[PDB]
Amino acid sequence: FENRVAEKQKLFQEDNGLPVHLKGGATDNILYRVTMTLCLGGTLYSLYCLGWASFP
Amino acid sequence: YQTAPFDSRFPNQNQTRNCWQNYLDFHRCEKAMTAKGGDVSVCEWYRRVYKSLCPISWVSTWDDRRAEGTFPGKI
Amino acid sequence: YQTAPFDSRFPNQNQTRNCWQNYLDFHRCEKAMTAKGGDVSVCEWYRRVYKSLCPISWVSTWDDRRAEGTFPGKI
Amino acid sequence: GARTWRFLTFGLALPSVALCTLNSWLHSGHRERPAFIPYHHLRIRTKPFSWGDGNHTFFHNPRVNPLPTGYE
Amino acid sequence: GARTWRFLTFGLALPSVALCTLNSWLHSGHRERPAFIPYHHLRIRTKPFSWGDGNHTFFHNPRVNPLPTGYE
Amino acid sequence: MFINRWLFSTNHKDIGTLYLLFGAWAGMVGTALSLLIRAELGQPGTLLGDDQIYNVVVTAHAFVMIFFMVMPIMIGGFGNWLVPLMIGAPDMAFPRMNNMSFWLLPPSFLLLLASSMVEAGAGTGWTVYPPLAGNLAHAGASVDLTIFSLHLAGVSSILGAINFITTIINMKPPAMSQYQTPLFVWSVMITAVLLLLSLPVLAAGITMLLTDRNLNTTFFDPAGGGDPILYQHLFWFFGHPEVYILILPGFGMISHIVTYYSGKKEPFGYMGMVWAMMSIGFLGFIVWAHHMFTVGMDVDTRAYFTSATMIIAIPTGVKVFSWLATLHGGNIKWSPAMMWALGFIFLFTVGGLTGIVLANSSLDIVLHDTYYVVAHFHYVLSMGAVFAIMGGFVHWFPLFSGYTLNDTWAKIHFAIMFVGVNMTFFPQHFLGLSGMPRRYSDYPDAYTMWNTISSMGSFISLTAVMLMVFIIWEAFASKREVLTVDLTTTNLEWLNGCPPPYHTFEEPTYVNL
Amino acid sequence: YEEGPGKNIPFSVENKWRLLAMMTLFFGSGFAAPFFIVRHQLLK
Amino acid sequence: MAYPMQLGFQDATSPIMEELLHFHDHTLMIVFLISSLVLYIISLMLTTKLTHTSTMDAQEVETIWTILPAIILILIALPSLRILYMMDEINNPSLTVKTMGHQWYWSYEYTDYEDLSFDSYMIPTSELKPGELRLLEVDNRVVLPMEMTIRMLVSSEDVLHSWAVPSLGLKTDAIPGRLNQTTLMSSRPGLYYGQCSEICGSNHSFMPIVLELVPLKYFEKWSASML
Amino acid sequence: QTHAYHMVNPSPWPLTGALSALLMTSGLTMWFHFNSMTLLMIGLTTNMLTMYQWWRDVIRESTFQGHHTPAVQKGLRYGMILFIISEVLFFTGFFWAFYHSSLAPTPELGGCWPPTGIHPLNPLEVPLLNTSVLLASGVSITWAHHSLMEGDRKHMLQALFITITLGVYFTLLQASEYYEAPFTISDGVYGSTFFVATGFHGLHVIIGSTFLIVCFFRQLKFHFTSNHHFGFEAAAWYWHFVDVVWLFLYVSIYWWGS
Numbered sequence A: 001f002e003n004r005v006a007e008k009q010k011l012f013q014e015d016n017g018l019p020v021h022l023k024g025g026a027t028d029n030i031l032y033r034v035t036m037t038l039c040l041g042g043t044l045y046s047l048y049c050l051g052w053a054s055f056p
Numbered sequence B, C: 001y002q003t004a005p006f007d008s009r010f011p012n013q014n015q016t017r018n019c020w021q022n023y024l025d026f027h028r029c030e031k032a033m034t035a036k037g038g039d040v041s042v043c044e045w046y047r048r049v050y051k052s053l054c055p056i057s058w059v060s061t062w063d064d065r066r067a068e069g070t071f072p073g074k075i
Numbered sequence D, E: 001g002a003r004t005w006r007f008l009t010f011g012l013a014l015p016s017v018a019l020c021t022l023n024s025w026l027h028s029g030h031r032e033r034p035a036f037i038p039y040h041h042l043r044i045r046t047k048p049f050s051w052g053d054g055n056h057t058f059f060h061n062p063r064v065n066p067l068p069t070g071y072e
Numbered sequence F: 001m002f003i004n005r006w007l008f009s010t011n012h013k014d015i016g017t018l019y020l021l022f023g024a025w026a027g028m029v030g031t032a033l034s035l036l037i038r039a040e041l042g043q044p045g046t047l048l049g050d051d052q053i054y055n056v057v058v059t060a061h062a063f064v065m066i067f068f069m070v071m072p073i074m075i076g077g078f079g080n081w082l083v084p085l086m087i088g089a090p091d092m093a094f095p096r097m098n099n100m101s102f103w104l105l106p107p108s109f110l111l112l113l114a115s116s117m118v119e120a121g122a123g124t125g126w127t128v129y130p131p132l133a134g135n136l137a138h139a140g141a142s143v144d145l146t147i148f149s150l151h152l153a154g155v156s157s158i159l160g161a162i163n164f165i166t167t168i169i170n171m172k173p174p175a176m177s178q179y180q181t182p183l184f185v186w187s188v189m190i191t192a193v194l195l196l197l198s199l200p201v202l203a204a205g206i207t208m209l210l211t212d213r214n215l216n217t218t219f220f221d222p223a224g225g226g227d228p229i230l231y232q233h234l235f236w237f238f239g240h241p242e243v244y245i246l247i248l249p250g251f252g253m254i255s256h257i258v259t260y261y262s263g264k265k266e267p268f269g270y271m272g273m274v275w276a277m278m279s280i281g282f283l284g285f286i287v288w289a290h291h292m293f294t295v296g297m298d299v300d301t302r303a304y305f306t307s308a309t310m311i312i313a314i315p316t317g318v319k320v321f322s323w324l325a326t327l328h329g330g331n332i333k334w335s336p337a338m339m340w341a342l343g344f345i346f347l348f349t350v351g352g353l354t355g356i357v358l359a360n361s362s363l364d365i366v367l368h369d370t371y372y373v374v375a376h377f378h379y380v381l382s383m384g385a386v387f388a389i390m391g392g393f394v395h396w397f398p399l400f401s402g403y404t405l406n407d408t409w410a411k412i413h414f415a416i417m418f419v420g421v422n423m424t425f426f427p428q429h430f431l432g433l434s435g436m437p438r439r440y441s442d443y444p445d446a447y448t449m450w451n452t453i454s455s456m457g458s459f460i461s462l463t464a465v466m467l468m469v470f471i472i473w474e475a476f477a478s479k480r481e482v483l484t485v486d487l488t489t490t491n492l493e494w495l496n497g498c499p500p501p502y503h504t505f506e507e508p509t510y511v512n513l
Numbered sequence G: 001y002e003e004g005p006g007k008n009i010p011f012s013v014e015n016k017w018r019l020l021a022m023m024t025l026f027f028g029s030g031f032a033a034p035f036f037i038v039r040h041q042l043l044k
Numbered sequence H: 001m002a003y004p005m006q007l008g009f010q011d012a013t014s015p016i017m018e019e020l021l022h023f024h025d026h027t028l029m030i031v032f033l034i035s036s037l038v039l040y041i042i043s044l045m046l047t048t049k050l051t052h053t054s055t056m057d058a059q060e061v062e063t064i065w066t067i068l069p070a071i072i073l074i075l076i077a078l079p080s081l082r083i084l085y086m087m088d089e090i091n092n093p094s095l096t097v098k099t100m101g102h103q104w105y106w107s108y109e110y111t112d113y114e115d116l117s118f119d120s121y122m123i124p125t126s127e128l129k130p131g132e133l134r135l136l137e138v139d140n141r142v143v144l145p146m147e148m149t150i151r152m153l154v155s156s157e158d159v160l161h162s163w164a165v166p167s168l169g170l171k172t173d174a175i176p177g178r179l180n181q182t183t184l185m186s187s188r189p190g191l192y193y194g195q196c197s198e199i200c201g202s203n204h205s206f207m208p209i210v211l212e213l214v215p216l217k218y219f220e221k222w223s224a225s226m227l
Numbered sequence I: 001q002t003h004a005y006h007m008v009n010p011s012p013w014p015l016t017g018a019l020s021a022l023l024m025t026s027g028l029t030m031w032f033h034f035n036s037m038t039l040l041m042i043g044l045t046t047n048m049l050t051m052y053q054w055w056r057d058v059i060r061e062s063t064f065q066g067h068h069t070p071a072v073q074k075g076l077r078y079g080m081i082l083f084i085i086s087e088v089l090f091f092t093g094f095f096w097a098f099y100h101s102s103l104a105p106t107p108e109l110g111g112c113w114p115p116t117g118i119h120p121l122n123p124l125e126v127p128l129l130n131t132s133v134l135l136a137s138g139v140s141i142t143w144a145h146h147s148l149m150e151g152d153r154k155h156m157l158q159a160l161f162i163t164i165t166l167g168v169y170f171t172l173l174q175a176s177e178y179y180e181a182p183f184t185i186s187d188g189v190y191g192s193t194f195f196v197a198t199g200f201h202g203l204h205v206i207i208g209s210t211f212l213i214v215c216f217f218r219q220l221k222f223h224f225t226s227n228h229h230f231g232f233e234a235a236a237w238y239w240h241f242v243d244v245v246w247l248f249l250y251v252s253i254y255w256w257g258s
């Protein structure tokens, strides 16, 4: 394999105002959206499950 | 015989092992006597002491387990 | 009785503790049976086993020490 | 140095593993299972397990792990 | 630094010694000496000692160290 | 922008602000629980129900006041706001991990409120002893939700401890030794070390309780060869350090408040104060079985725990005397914060001294599991930890907000709360000495007078809590902006203005050797 | 981000009456919760 | 039992409880004096316009601040530990009684001679007889001989409880799988009350202890009548 | 800025991690009591997503953006030491439980250790092999460290591969021993102490092996310099911690407890 670190240093230092968690490009946005959707949706489901479990 | 005397082997607040030891000693003694056809009367001291100290439910459970074959102490 | 049987407590070449344990057991039993005025025939197994296994000089020394009040084992 | 730690890896550490692998290899093979006795301090069931029929441990081995009622 | 080790010396170590010194100095009383029993595994004499009458240990204390024949 | 700033924060000040808001909300929940307790106890006979609903309330009261009010305010709130400013650091060592310490608390709190909503609640005491907390006597989800609540709070605090220790060791100006950091910074470092060592043992113990409840383990079940007393040792190995964790940041705030309102540049006997806090932290690990004097341990063990416990009075007394010596010769400013601090010194001393009474195992036989214990710990918590929180809040509110409180309203607040807490807890000494047990929904008729007066006290404290909300509203409603602050030369957290910019110490301080 | 008094908080202090409503809801919800939980337990 | 408006301990019924009252008196004097001195010194530090704000030397005064508290703690610990070891001394009991905690009542076992055992439950408020005490009376009292050393053994058949009688200086936790020992000796006949002292669920408040202390001859006849 | 410290970009991973903790704990509750794994599987998934993205971002910040100055690296060293200390105290609780039960065996066990009816594993068979495996892995990881400091890419990768192989061997051997064991977690306090203490250890071996695999792929991608490689140092410290815990388990539970 070859050392491609310099190419990643250029990408992640680009002066584009992106926070580090999105600076890799479109794949970062997709993985963020999947993560936050599962977190917020799972949290709403955990609250439904409490509602259910709160009564006999 | 009034009650179980102070036993220097068991001088502290926790008397669990005092009950256990006397229960074991009685049943070991009873087995050793019944085996030779000797006299279980020699075992009486251990019987009085464990009866004095041991909760009824502990004795009852241990007796049940000896009869079941599930008593985990060596007799 | 021919000789002392195998004892799973003492399975190795060093039989010192087998001799010692059976000597103690005989004398603890003989003291228990004398204490109630029970019968020492009950103690016979232990006597045959220690007599079989123990060197005469060990038995004779231990006997002398019990008589002297210098036997270091608990009877 | 790296040279010394590689020397220890191949000259001591891996030979030790090979010898202990031999030793375990030689003492393997199934030993007989003990008579079942329904001891009250074993095969504890205060709540069903959250898998299977509730009565089998997670890595239950039918050959050596009896249920509260004995071997399967 | 030196300042930290001095702080530990005076703030932890020497206070510990003072507390253990107080504890010892509370249980310093002389205990009741035990009945003499001429046990064969104690008061060993296979050769006379190379000092005194050959029968006294080097830091013999008459109050607590009996001879083979008992307390002096 | 709102989400980026307040849900995705990497800023020590904003995270501090989130902790203070969380702790304030938790304080209202804890106060409502305390009032339900005293509403039941304020008249003989049953008001609410049998001991189950009563002890669900008592249990929740304790977990809320400890884990959701005191620790988040003192450590998350004052610690995050003040520690970086007092060492000239640009933020915490791990500014993103800091945010996760905060966000673990709302879920932890949700699990505790779920515990109370499902089945019959966790009516266990905050100690959660088995077998009452086990799967026979507390069948169903309530205790498991309580255990998980404690797991999330524990992870929050463990990661926070790692963050504070690293920040305080690693991010001072290079010329600044540990012996040139302010006492509040020392108090947080020592608290963080206690958290790092104590919470994992709690985690082990409550995990064992979880497996006894759900995986047929028997750590605490004699049927399997377990021991309920093992749970108590593991819990209290955490629990005694936990009370020092609750007070130490309070001691640090009191040192700053007494110094400031005495007009002093420095507390009396700085190195003695450092020595005292490290000695208290250390001794706090070797005393836990004073919570177990009635369980049946050996006499020599009781003698050791009595003696080791009493030793804590020596470093603690050095702190009390050093506060008095800080007042000595002061140009005293009778600010509301100073009134909280003076109340602290006296009322904490009283509670510490009733702790010394309890340290005596022979007398503890009669006082254990009575209201005497309840009187002791509320003097140190409801009049100690809380008075340090209120003094620090009114002292630093203008730093955090840029606005001033009405000092006359704040003095009224102090006066009402002082009367209420003393009326609530002083008579509980009498209930304890005369034998009223803990965790009772109802009491024999003889105990009526003191329970009645105690409950009347609790209502006075409620009036104070309601007034505090109004006082914070009035400050934000009126918008009196800060102009000048005295003694900035010995109070670095004030030197960047009120409030300080989002980024402070972008250019670090200059300190030479 | 906005800096200065009233801007370093996750709630608005632009209108003291809107703020009173928000503070009422915030602290009032925490204080009310245990009463409603006790009611819930008593009604099973 | 406790009485209305009570400030201190129940009157001592046993010599050890007497010892605990005098030890509490000694300790409370110290607590009062230290509390009072701190309050006074606060008031002294706060009542002068005179000032001294320059750096103050701490080491001389810190000697006093550490040594005087250390002496006071020793003056508490010495009598404290004397009492601790007095309660632990060997005594030779005449009688052993067991108590087993349950949800929510106590059982008692007197098995030195005969299999005597019974359950002891709170009298419900609606069933109290005129003059009886709410939440304190039981149906079956723990009858015991006065002026005799009694061994009490305490355990549980379910959750934790704790067996307490404040006027005798007693509190022994009731732990399943454990047999805890204490000694009981009443100087006087009468009725001595206590209450369960470990949270044990729904009726923790409602499982009291009533000792009935009578002469040996009466105890012997009661014992025979309970078989 | 004219200090050397790292001002981190506003990040969603703290919130996603906190919510993953709510979903895992509410999920375990739902599994233990309401016969459903759904919430738990969502929580485990969000936890893995959060860890992946958080540590990915730390690599971006360090390897790709240069934010890890010596001062930042020193902070991380303290952070990892303090984390390891917290994990030592967690295991201490389990050792306390073990010694409490084994030193004073109750009548229910037969008043002996091991309890009546427990047939312990032979400590000289697979447990000794497991000991040789983790000790050997402590040697190979040290070789890997020195190779990296000496600038030797191939020998670093070989030594690290060997270390990971040994971690996997340990895990497979322990899995086999779990299956073969004639006692279970439900076999009283013997099974309780054995499986919870060795099970938390096994989890830490899996975590440590995963950390070493992350280091292996970063090394393959040339992230590490001969002087700057904190992720590798942290993984090695964690790995030594896992070794030492094993040695204490081996001496305490397998040997002294047999």
Ligand code: HEA
Binding pocket: F020, F023, F024, F027, F028, F030, F031, F034, F035, F037, F038, F058, F059, F061, F062, F065, F066, F069, F070, F073, F124, F125, F126, F127, F374, F378, F381, F382, F385, F386, F389, F390, F393, F421, F424, F437, F438, F439, F440, F441, F458, F461, F462, F465
């Ligand atoms: C920090 C801990 C803490 C605090 C402050 C309190 C405060 C109070 N507690 Fe207590 N309590 C405990 C911890 C605490 N408690 C514990 C651990 C137990 C034992 C539980 C068990 O047995 O298992 C207990 C038990 C307990 C009992 C015994 C119950 C029983 O045994 O049956 C009683 C009885 O009256 C009581 C009452 C009160 C009252 C009336 C207050 C009042 O003084 C409260 C008044 C309100 C406040 C003090 C304000 C709170 C809010 C803030 C400070 C937020 C401020 C806002 C900003 C800074 C913006 N509590």
Ligand code: HEA
Binding pocket: F127, F243, F244, F246, F247, F290, F291, F309, F310, F312, F313, F314, F316, F317, F318, F320, F348, F349, F350, F351, F352, F353, F354, F355, F356, F358, F359, F360, F364, F367, F368, F369, F373, F376, F377, F380, F381, F384, F385, H034, H038, H068, H069, H070, H072, H073
């Ligand atoms: C902030 C909280 C906090 C603090 C700081 C303390 C501090 C102390 N506590 Fe307390 N304690 C609790 C919170 C606290 N405690 C809680 C919550 C419980 C109950 C747990 C439960 O069961 O739910 C409790 C229970 C508890 C018990 C168990 C009682 C029982 O359950 O039977 C004991 C036993 O020794 C104890 C002792 C002490 C001592 C000796 C101190 C010392 O640190 C006090 C030291 C201070 C001083 C002594 C005052 C200042 C000193 C001087 C002015 C010098 C001169 C003094 C002398 C010479 C004496 N406390």
Ligand SMILES: CCCCC/C=C/C/C=C/C/C=C/C/C=C\CCCC(=O)O[C@H](COC(=O)CCCCCCCCCCCCCCCCC)COP(=O)(O)OCCN
Binding pocket: E057, E058, E059, E060, E061, E065
């Ligand atoms: C106070 C703090 C410690 C002080 C140390 C000892 C002080 C005196 C002796 C110094 C040298 C000690 C070294 C160890 C040797 C043996 C015994 C020393 C221990 C000792 O002092 O033990 C004493 C006996 O000494 C005895 O016999 C007699 C002791 C004198 C004769 C010793 C001769 C043996 C020398 C052997 C030399 C070998 C060297 C090895 C070299 C190796 C190189 C390859 C104990 O007193 P006691 O009355 O029996 O019991 C107390 C009753 N109240």
Ligand SMILES: CCCCC/C=C\C/C=C/C/C=C\C/C=C\CCCC(=O)O[C@H](COC(=O)CCCCCCCCCCCCCCCCC)COP(=O)(O)OCCN
Binding pocket: D057, D058, D059, D060, D061, D065, F150, F151, F152, F154, F155, F203, F207, F210, F211, F215, I171, I174, I175, I178, I179, I180, I181, I182, I183, I184, I185, I186, I195, I196, I198, I199, I200, I202, I203
């Ligand atoms: C090869 C080693 C690797 C272990 C991985 C295996 C299994 C899943 C995960 C394990 C995690 C570690 C410990 C958790 C506790 C128990 C599992 C112990 C190890 C184990 O796997 O034990 C097994 C039982 O598993 C069981 O009950 C299974 C139980 C599964 C559910 C686990 C519940 C998790 C508990 C919550 C953890 C809380 C963490 C707290 C964090 C701190 C916060 C402050 C043993 O099998 P057995 O059939 O009884 O006997 C063998 C007979 N032939």
Ligand SMILES: CCCCCC/C=C\CCCCCCCCCC(=O)O[C@H](COC(=O)CCCCCCCCCCCCCCC)COP(=O)(O)OC[C@@H](O)CO
Binding pocket: I051, I055, I056, I058, I059, I062, I063, I068, I076, I080, I083, I206, I207, I208, I210, I211, I214, I223, I224, I225, I228, I229, I230, I231, I232, I234
């Ligand atoms: C089935 C099991 C599921 C359970 C979930 C956990 C499973 C697996 C987790 C495995 C851990 C992987 C950690 C990967 C960290 C990658 C980031 C990293 O290593 O980051 C390094 C910094 O270290 C740092 O943050 C140090 C970061 C260290 C953190 C690791 C701590 C271990 C995590 C424990 C998690 C839970 C344990 C508790 C269980 C009870 C980056 O600096 P360098 O390396 O100097 O590079 C810079 C040079 O290139 C410049 O020239």
Ligand SMILES: CCCCCCCCCCO[C@@H]1O[C@H](CO)[C@@H](O[C@H]2O[C@H](CO)[C@@H](O)[C@H](O)[C@H]2O)[C@H](O)[C@H]1O
Binding pocket: A037, A038, A040, A041, A042, A045, I034, I035, I036, I037, I038, I039, I042
């Ligand atoms: C991005 C958003 C996040 C996604 C949220 C998804 C929520 C929807 C999940 C579906 O809900 C499920 O319903 C099943 C009902 O069929 C339950 O079955 C369980 O309960 C059944 C009751 O009939 C039993 O048969 C079994 O225990 C079991 O199948 C199961 O518990 C539950 O999860």
Ligand SMILES: CCCCCCCCCCO[C@@H]1O[C@H](CO)[C@@H](O[C@H]2O[C@H](CO)[C@@H](O)[C@H](O)[C@H]2O)[C@H](O)[C@H]1O
Binding pocket: D050, D051, D052, I035, I036, I037, I038
């Ligand atoms: C990406 C977001 C959208 C996807 C949302 C996820 C959807 C998953 C819903 C499925 O729910 C499951 O239903 C199973 C049965 O219907 C349950 O098995 C349960 O029942 C089995 C047999 O009925 C038992 O063997 C198991 O032990 C037991 O947990 C299982 O727990 C539960 O998870």
Ligand SMILES: C[C@H](CCC(=O)O)[C@H]1CC[C@H]2[C@@H]3[C@H](O)C[C@@H]4C[C@H](O)CC[C@]4(C)[C@H]3C[C@H](O)[C@]12C
Binding pocket: A001, A002, I153, I154, I157, I158, I161
């Ligand atoms: C060909 C490649 C070169 C890597 C590089 O320099 O880019 C080599 C160098 C070290 C090699 C690794 C090491 O030799 C260790 C392993 C040896 C096994 O026989 C194959 C996998 C194994 C994990 C190797 C894979 C691969 O061939 C690597 C990574």
Ligand SMILES: C[C@H](CCC(=O)O)[C@H]1CC[C@H]2[C@@H]3[C@H](O)C[C@@H]4C[C@H](O)CC[C@]4(C)[C@H]3C[C@H](O)[C@]12C
Binding pocket: E003, E006, E007, E010, E011, E012, E015, F271, F272, F275, F318, H059, H062, H063, H064, H066
């Ligand atoms: C040596 C150390 C630091 C001094 C410094 O470097 O400034 C100081 C700070 C606090 C001091 C201690 C505290 O003042 C408390 C104690 C006071 C006694 O008079 C001496 C012992 C005593 C335990 C002190 C020993 C030592 O002088 C300490 C530990």
Ligand code: CUA
Binding pocket: H101, H102, H104, H160, H161, H162, H196, H197, H198, H199, H200, H201, H203, H204, H205, H207
């Ligand atoms: Cu029984 Cu409380």
Ligand SMILES: [O-][O-]
Binding pocket: F239, F240, F243
């Ligand atoms: O805990 O005092």
Ligand SMILES: [Ca+2]
Binding pocket: F039, F040, F041, F042, F043, F044, F045, F046, F047, F441, F442
């Ligand atoms: Ca009522």
Ligand SMILES: [Cu+2]
Binding pocket: F239, F240, F243, F287, F288, F290, F291
């Ligand atoms: Cu404590």
